[PDB]
Amino acid sequence: SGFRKMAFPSGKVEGCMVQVTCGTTTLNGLWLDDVVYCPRHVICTSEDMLNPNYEDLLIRKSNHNFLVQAGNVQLRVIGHSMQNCVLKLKVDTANPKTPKYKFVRIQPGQTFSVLACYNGSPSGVYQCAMRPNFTIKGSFLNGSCGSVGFNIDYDCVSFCYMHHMELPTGVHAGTDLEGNFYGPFVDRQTAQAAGTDTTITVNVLAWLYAAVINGDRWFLNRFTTTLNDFNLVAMKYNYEPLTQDHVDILGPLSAQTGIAVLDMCASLKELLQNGMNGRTILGSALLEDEFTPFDVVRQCSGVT
Amino acid sequence: SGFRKMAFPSGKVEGCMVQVTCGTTTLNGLWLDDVVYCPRHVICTSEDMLNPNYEDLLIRKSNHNFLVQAGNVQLRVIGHSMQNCVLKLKVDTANPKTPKYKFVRIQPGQTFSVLACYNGSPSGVYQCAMRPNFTIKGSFLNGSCGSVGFNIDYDCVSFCYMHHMELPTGVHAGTDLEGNFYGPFVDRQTAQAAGTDTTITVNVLAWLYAAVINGDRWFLNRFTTTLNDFNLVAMKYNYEPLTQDHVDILGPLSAQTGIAVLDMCASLKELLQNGMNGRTILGSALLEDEFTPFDVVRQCSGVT
Ligand SMILES: O=C(Cc1cccc(Cl)c1)Nc1cncc2ccccc12
Numbered sequence: 001s002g003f004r005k006m007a008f009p010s011g012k013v014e015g016c017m018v019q020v021t022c023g024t025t026t027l028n029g030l031w032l033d034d035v036v037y038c039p040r041h042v043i044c045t046s047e048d049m050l051n052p053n054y055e056d057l058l059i060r061k062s063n064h065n066f067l068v069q070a071g072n073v074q075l076r077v078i079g080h081s082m083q084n085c086v087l088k089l090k091v092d093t094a095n096p097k098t099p100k101y102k103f104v105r106i107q108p109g110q111t112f113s114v115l116a117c118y119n120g121s122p123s124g125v126y127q128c129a130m131r132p133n134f135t136i137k138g139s140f141l142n143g144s145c146g147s148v149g150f151n152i153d154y155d156c157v158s159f160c161y162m163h164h165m166e167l168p169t170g171v172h173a174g175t176d177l178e179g180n181f182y183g184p185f186v187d188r189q190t191a192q193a194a195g196t197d198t199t200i201t202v203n204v205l206a207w208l209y210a211a212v213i214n215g216d217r218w219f220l221n222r223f224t225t226t227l228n229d230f231n232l233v234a235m236k237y238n239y240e241p242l243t244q245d246h247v248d249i250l251g252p253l254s255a256q257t258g259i260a261v262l263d264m265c266a267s268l269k270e271l272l273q274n275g276m277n278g279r280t281i282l283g284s285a286l287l288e289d290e291f292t293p294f295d296v297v298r299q300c301s302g303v304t
Numbered sequence: 305s306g307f308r309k310m311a312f313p314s315g316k317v318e319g320c321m322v323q324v325t326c327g328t329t330t331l332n333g334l335w336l337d338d339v340v341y342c343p344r345h346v347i348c349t350s351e352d353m354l355n356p357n358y359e360d361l362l363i364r365k366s367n368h369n370f371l372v373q374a375g376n377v378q379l380r381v382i383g384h385s386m387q388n389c390v391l392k393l394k395v396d397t398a399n400p401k402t403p404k405y406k407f408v409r410i411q412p413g414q415t416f417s418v419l420a421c422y423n424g425s426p427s428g429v430y431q432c433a434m435r436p437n438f439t440i441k442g443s444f445l446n447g448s449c450g451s452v453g454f455n456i457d458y459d460c461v462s463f464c465y466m467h468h469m470e471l472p473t474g475v476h477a478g479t480d481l482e483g484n485f486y487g488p489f490v491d492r493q494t495a496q497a498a499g500t501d502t503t504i505t506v507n508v509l510a511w512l513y514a515a516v517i518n519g520d521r522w523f524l525n526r527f528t529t530t531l532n533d534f535n536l537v538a539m540k541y542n543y544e545p546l547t548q549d550h551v552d553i554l555g556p557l558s559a560q561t562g563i564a565v566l567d568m569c570a571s572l573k574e575l576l577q578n579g580m581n582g583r584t585i586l587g588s589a590l591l592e593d594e595f596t597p598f599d600v601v602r603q604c605s606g607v608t
């Protein structure tokens with residue numbers, strides 16, 4: 001029993017973290033096989049960041065300008081290339097600690113763990129969701145760039161995020177491991193609109209199922225609703241519209257608890273319309289949307 | 305910017321996890337140097353758990369009855385001993401992945417990371433506080449026994465908790481690494497009173513300082529209070545009384561923000577008396593007490 005905002009064990013990713021320095025800028029890099037991946041803005045100074053011409057800034061750099069250090073050991077850089085907003089530094093040594101890995105582009109609403117790093121050294125690990133507007137509400141300071149987000153399936157690390165920037169609003173933006181930003185963001189020091197965000201409805205329903213499994217049942221009611229009716233309420237409260245694909249993913253939790261998905265939607269409907277009334281669910285006084293249906297089942301039934 | 309319930313990177317602890325089997329019971333063990341530490345109830349069956357005579361149950365076991373497996377490799381057990389509620393299994397091989405480590409007994413109100421494990425395999429990592437009543441509100445299922453709690457100071461792992469039991473209330477109890485339970489708990493399947501719990505006042509104040517640092521300032525007011533006055537309010541709301549030692553630990557956060565500790569107590573006083581008014585602080589709709597003053601500074605200023 002109990003339900004926590006649990007992250008994947010970070011060991012496999014800690015083994016991949018390196019420090020990358022170019023000029024006077026230092027950030028984190030990800031060393032997988034004989035390649036180190038890092039944000040391309042490692043080649044910028046603060047004067048360059050208003051609107052960098054990355055192709056021109058990179059032409060001024062040679063392999064020997066990229067200093068890569070894995071703890072204490074120095075890596076020899078034998079190639080460099082820019083792919084979208086990431087640099088790929090070919091090194092002469094394959095990382096002996098490279099786990100089995102994949103590069104994936106996650107969908108908005110999915111969750112992942114972040115290993116926050118500074119100077120190539122891991123500082124902490126936390127779990128978060130990719131917002132529907134493609135920002136992440138992380139915890140990052142200057143020098144965290146290059147820290148990565150990931151999921152783990154037994155022995156396989158699926159890397160999904162590399163941290164690049166903090167928007168003036170204090171929320172975070174970054175790329176997949178091919179350097180494509182999630183959302184409309186660009187790697188420039190400009191004010192950039194993050195879209196209207198919404199609450200991840202399928203995750204709130206998953207978390208209500210986790211609450212029932214863990215004994216928090218006070219919000220269950222005598223009602224039911226329809227997808228149509230529920231979606232009018234989702235609209236009013238800035239929740240993602242629920243689809244049959246969401247109801248289908250909630251199937252296992254519905255079977256586990258014996259609570260039909262639309263009956264749980266009627267509980268969510270009443271909580272949106274009436275609030276928590278000074279009560280809590282799984283130690284939260286708000287509706288939590290950072291656990292997917294997969295996360296709840298993994299946490300409540302067990303997977304290593 | 306941003307503030308998350310951040311855990312320490314778990315890699316150093318993942319390298320120490322093993323599976324321990326005795327008879328038909330399997331749980332997790334911690335392999336440090338040539339010793340494996342695990343809950344002594346690995347020697348019990350379900351018939352034994354109502355009131356085990358641990359000394360007699362252990363006399364029936366020999367070194368060859370304790371099966372220890374580190375991933376795939378089998379460890380040869382050359383000694384066994386019970387110390388309080390833990391078993392220490394001497395193995396013929398020192399763990400090559402033993403980090404620099406210490407065994408510490410944490411105080412109530414302090415925080416630590418938990419690496420939840422099943423069958424010697426890490427499943428996830430989360431941060432939590434040792435409650436003032438010596439329970440932990442973890443997330444654990446059957447087979448999680450032997451999972452450990454820890455803190456990390458650069459390269460040193462200070463192990464503070466080994467998980468033993470889930471109380472009928474769904475909260476968790478365990479021991480320090482010498483096998484002494486935190487709190488009044490005993491390793492028996494009986495209903496056991498956990499004391500009256502309280503909210504960790506110094507941690508709520510630390511988290512209000514983290515909120516101000518991160519831009520959440522709405523709760524700051526024109527008032528101040530005294531330790532005496534604040535403690536009357538702490539009493540009414542089941543908060544730990546604040547002492548000068550707590551005010552002293554909050555010194556760095558007070559200097560960082562320029563907000564005197566007693567002025568922040570007056571903000572906490574008004575939040576206790578008036579509630580959040582449907583507002584949030586650092587994404588929470590309740591007052592958070594799982595971040596110590598050290599955690600806030602480590603997270604807001606940066607340490608690896
Ligand atoms: O935002 C950046 C640098 C940058 C600037 C403009 C564009 C790009 Cl691509 C990168 N760094 C930081 C990333 N996370 C958190 C931060 C917290 C405080 C200060 C900087 C922080």
Ligand SMILES: O=C(Cc1cccc(Cl)c1)Nc1cncc2ccccc12
Pocket residue numbers: 001345353444445446447448449468469470471490491492493494
């Ligand atoms: O409680 C125990 C076993 C036990 C019983 C009595 C006394 C002692 Cl010392 C140990 N296991 C579990 C530990 N955490 C979480 C659990 C969740 C579900 C089931 C068992 C769980």
